[PDB]
Structure 1
Amino acid sequence: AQSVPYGVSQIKAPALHSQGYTGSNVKVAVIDSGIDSSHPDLKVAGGASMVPSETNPFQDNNSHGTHVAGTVAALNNSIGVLGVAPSASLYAVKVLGADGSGQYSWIINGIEWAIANNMDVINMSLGGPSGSAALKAAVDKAVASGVVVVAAAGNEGTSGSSSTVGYPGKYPSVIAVGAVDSSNQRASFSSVGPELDVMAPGVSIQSTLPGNKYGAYNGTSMASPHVAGAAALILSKHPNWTNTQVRSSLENTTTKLGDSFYYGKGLINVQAAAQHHHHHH
């Protein structure tokens, strides 16, 4: 039997599923460490690798990309977990190697691939403390081209009054996502700052792991794909909505939590986002 991880329920994805919307025909690039395409609870539609020494994007030597992918799009069937957008067209855009790291040029090459291949949504469960003009130009180009770009806010916790949101989350064109637990409390590690946009579940998140396994991971990496999956559900119900509209719909219908420095606009609610008229609950 399939299990629905609590975070998928918490963002109200089942309300979209019961309306008949599961992300069909929406192309989501998981820009990460690859995705294990042999996992029976995933269907990988395509992809490419930007990692010079690991040329196969369908081999995930780290595990992280496969876990992120299962939160976006684990299949709706009688096994494992259910994904947020279980019918999405899932693309493995490998820009991180086995050790979890990649060069800025690899990430930028992956973003360019996603633009060239008409991805509707990019998820980047990744980041670093400095930007670059070229990284900023790549995300800005993706957004100008119509892509919804979602990234982890970072796991730097607090540092007084300073922002600790990392890049590319910290760029205005990117939706930076922080992590809450099942009680809607901010995770202690979740980055903070005026660039934090929305929150999603990021504590003890069950998802797919390579070699037909499952497991619970923590991080803003786990929160981000709930929002990328929610964007795919929204586009499956409203296929002509622009990225601008998808982003506003998620921002405008969060459940507000605390101060925006720590919680941004609050917890996403994809049921409310996918209505025509938006308000916070």
Structure 2
Amino acid sequence: VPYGVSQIKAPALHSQGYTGSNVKVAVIDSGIDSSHPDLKVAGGASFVPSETNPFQDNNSHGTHVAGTVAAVAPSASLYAVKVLGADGSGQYSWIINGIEWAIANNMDVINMSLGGPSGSAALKAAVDKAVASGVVVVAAAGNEGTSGSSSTVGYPGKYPSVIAVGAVDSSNQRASFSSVGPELDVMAPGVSIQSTLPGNKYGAKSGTCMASPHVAGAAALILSKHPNWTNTQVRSSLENTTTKLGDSFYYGKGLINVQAAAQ
């Protein structure tokens, strides 16, 4: 549909009848506008104390992330895990509560197009438990760019259990904003991403946040072909089948190729 879908080689799988059917993807974000004609929301939960409806997206972020998951894996069961309020901010407890729900509710893929500058024993415990429980955990690397020689990969992206996603444009160039470090795993399209917006709209957003869902959608396609495959196997296939770009500090393993990873 959008250029980023074709770029990751998703359409080849779609033509084959692999569209992410029976894959439960949790969008741990600002909610999802379930009212959008182009989105099918299966369930979810809100963990934002003042915004009790997960199906009301007061930000726009979670609907845009969800629509990218949907563009990659059209048949995937989308779950709106509302952890971020109208301002796009959320407390760590709300976020961790949303991961805890995703595990509890047998989500196959977690998408976290979110990041914080600091970790916690509780955040690491939550991601680790998800992984140990066979969930594919995908997160945005962060929008911190370059910072001397140091990692600018945010949390939870920083944790070895999480697939940390960096952003490339349509040319396969690293976006100037894309966080860097040894914890960067893969690259996906993350510059001027056309996706669904609340109130039957479409618009572009840029960020590693936009790159993350292409991988979460990519993990849904793999699981649709290979329902038997472990989260470990899904991850290894995505990482081992990449189009090799530059240095792993900047590009991770390179750009994901869903066609090559699906075998």
Per the normalisation by structure 1, the TM-score is 0.93
For 1:16 and 1:176, how far apart are their aligned partners in 2? 23
For 1:192 and 1:108, how far apart are their aligned partners in 2? 24
For 1:174 and 1:189, how far apart are their aligned partners in 2? 20
Cα deviation, 1:221-262, whole Å, max 9, x if unaligned, reads 000000000000000000010100000010000000001111
Structure 2: gaps of 5 or more residues: none
Cα deviation, 1:105-130, whole Å, max 9, x if unaligned, reads 10000001000100000000001100
**Residue 217 of structure 2 is aligned with which of 214, 220, 229?**
229
Cα deviation, 1:29-71, whole Å, max 9, x if unaligned, reads 0000000000000000000000000000000000000000000
Superposition deviation, residue 171 in structure 1: 0.4
Cα deviation, 1:61-87, whole Å, max 9, x if unaligned, reads 00000000000014xxxxxxxxx0000
Aligned-partner SS, 2:139: strand
Structure 1: gaps of 5 or more residues: 75-83, 276-281
Please name the residue that 2:102 is paired with: 114
Counterpart check, 1:208 vs 2:196: yes
Please name the residue that 2:41 is paired with: 44
Cα deviation, 1:144-166, whole Å, max 9, x if unaligned, reads 00000000000000011110000
For 1:267 and 1:162, how far apart are their aligned partners in 2? 22
For 2:12 and 2:148, how far apart are their aligned partners in 1? 39
For 2:107 and 2:249, how far apart are their aligned partners in 1? 31
Superposition deviation, residue 180 in structure 1: 0.2
For 1:231 and 1:131, how far apart are their aligned partners in 2? 25
Aligned-partner SS, 1:90: strand
Superposition deviation, residue 19 in structure 1: 1.1
Please name the residue that 1:79 is paired with: none
For 2:22 and 2:110, how far apart are their aligned partners in 1? 15
For 1:128 and 1:239, how far apart are their aligned partners in 2? 32
Cα deviation, 1:180-224, whole Å, max 9, x if unaligned, reads 000000000000000000000000100000000000110000000
Superposition deviation, residue 99 in structure 1: 0.5
Percent identity, aligned pairs only, is 98
For 1:257 and 1:155, how far apart are their aligned partners in 2? 19
Counterpart check, 1:91 vs 2:88: no
Aligned-partner SS, 2:15: helix
Per the normalisation by structure 2, the TM-score is 1.00
Moved over 3 A (4+): none
For 1:7 and 1:152, how far apart are their aligned partners in 2? 16
**Residue 192 of structure 1 is aligned with which of 152, 177, 180?**
180
Superposition deviation, residue 100 in structure 1: 0.5
Please name the residue that 2:140 is paired with: 152
Please name the residue that 1:274 is paired with: 262
Cα deviation, 1:256-275, whole Å, max 9, x if unaligned, reads 00011110000000000000
Superposition deviation, residue 18 in structure 1: 1.0
For 2:76 and 2:45, how far apart are their aligned partners in 1? 17
